[PDB]
Design a protein around this ligand. Structure first.
Ligand SMILES: CSC[C@H]1CN(Cc2c[nH]c3c(N)ncnc23)C[C@@H]1O
Ligand SMILES: CSC[C@H]1CN(Cc2c[nH]c3c(N)ncnc23)C[C@@H]1O
Lengths: 237, 237
């Protein structure tokens, strides 16, 4: 099997990039693809750039050219769930666009026309995420709805909008729904395994730059454990 | 040369689809690609689906697999310029995301992180659009800023947010900034040539239903004229 791993920023992919053996680097359309193995499993790591369009474009190139069997989205996120602290892992049960509104034509809020209302994380991949979490016993995670938009959420008004329309939201970020929607269109299983850098408030621009390395470390530790598990997961292999 | 043409919806691509000689249809990732010739020029017509993520993934697949020399985005739009009636044409001078906000990190409103603030349409393609307009004297057109978001704009509050932040906007829609950003990352010239189906207000849902066919007709006639000009002029090799 081949594991696709996607992160937006250089800082988000650095830890995993350094673990790739026999690394082959390709640059295309503002994306960087690193292929090789991590601990004996084939991987392709994509640094996509920030936001929904870059993430969608990169994911489409990833799937069409490299044919990963699964896709794992790594990186940082803004926490909405009360139980999350900076550094904690967040796992997608499902992903929605918090900034999509085609309700004029009867779609529910966040649902894009021609799409399901939500993109559900793959059940088998989810089981692997759970096993990985069980192998990191002193770490706290929350699983739930992750909401994506083309905005860095850092105001009370935007928090209120997102909570009012997506009351179960546990975290927000800027790529996951694009990755998830793209995987959905290609019929490729995905899961998001990110970690909290800030709590999406007026302090978040400062918190984010301060704690991005911590979030990358936490998210990357989980993704690495998942890679290790997938190595000997006979359903996927 | 090879001309790439992109529209979101079935009605938006139907007129041009019917003109393709020796048509070859490929279905991939929830997109449809029609390849062949229109009046002796190679074309690839992408039916992208609706919204930024579908448009981005489709455009990435289009450019990476078919290598069009230029990209023309056709279809409908919500008019903002006061002079626009349903059926009138809009030509992009440039495109912006009206729903992007990373101003917390120094970017201007609508600018995505890691991107320029606007995506400028290609000068030669704009010239060809103007030449086409001159040969269609009973089409009224406005050239200017087109703004994109993952929303069907149909409320005074949303219309006014967009006008406040992008005062020169002439029309809005849901794919162009994704196409434009993707073309920017691949370094492929683009232009948007759309036509008005509604004026982005409370009556837009009904206006859109009524006037989508007219908008497809008007925009497609312009695009066909542009195809004929591009065949003749050798502007692009
Ligand atoms: C430099 S732009 C921010 C980058 C970090 N990614 C995740 C993220 C952390 N905190 C967030 C918040 N409060 N709102 C939205 N997104 C995020 C999103 C983007 O790649
Ligand atoms: C069924 S969703 C609408 C489809 C038609 N496209 C253009 C468009 C016309 N009027 C618009 C408006 N008021 N707001 C945003 N977009 C548009 C966008 C999408 O493909």
């Amino acid at each position: 099997m081949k594991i696709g791993i996607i992160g937006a920023m250089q800082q988000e992919v650095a830890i995993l990039k350094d673990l790739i053996e026999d690394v082959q680097e390709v640059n295309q359309a503002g994306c960087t693809f690193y292929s090789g193995q991590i601990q004996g499993v084939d991987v392709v790591l994509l640094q996509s750039g920030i936001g929904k369009v870059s993430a969608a474009l990169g994911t489409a190139l990833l799937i069409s050219q490299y044919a990963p069997d699964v896709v794992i989205n790594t990186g940082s996120a803004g926490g909405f769930d009360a139980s999350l602290n900076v550094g904690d892992v967040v796992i997608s049960s499902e992903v929605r666009h918090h900034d999509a509104d085609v309700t004029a034509f009867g779609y529910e809020i966040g649902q894009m026309a021609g799409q399901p209302a939500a993109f559900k994380a793959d059940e088998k991949l989810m089981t692997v995420a759970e096993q990985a979490l069980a192998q990191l016993p002193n770490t706290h995670a929350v699983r739930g709805l992750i909401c994506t938009g083309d905005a860095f959420v850092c105001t009370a008004e935007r928090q209120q909008f997102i909570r009012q329309h997506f009351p179960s939201v546990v975290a927000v970020e800027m790529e996951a729904s694009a990755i998830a929607q793209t995987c959905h269109q290609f019929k490729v299983p995905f899961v998001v395994v990110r970690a909290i850098s800030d709590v999406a408030d007026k302090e978040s621009p400062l918190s984010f730059e301060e704690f991005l390395p911590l979030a990358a470390k936490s998210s990357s530790a989980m993704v690495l454990k998942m890679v290790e598990l997938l190595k000997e997961n006979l359903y996927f292999q």
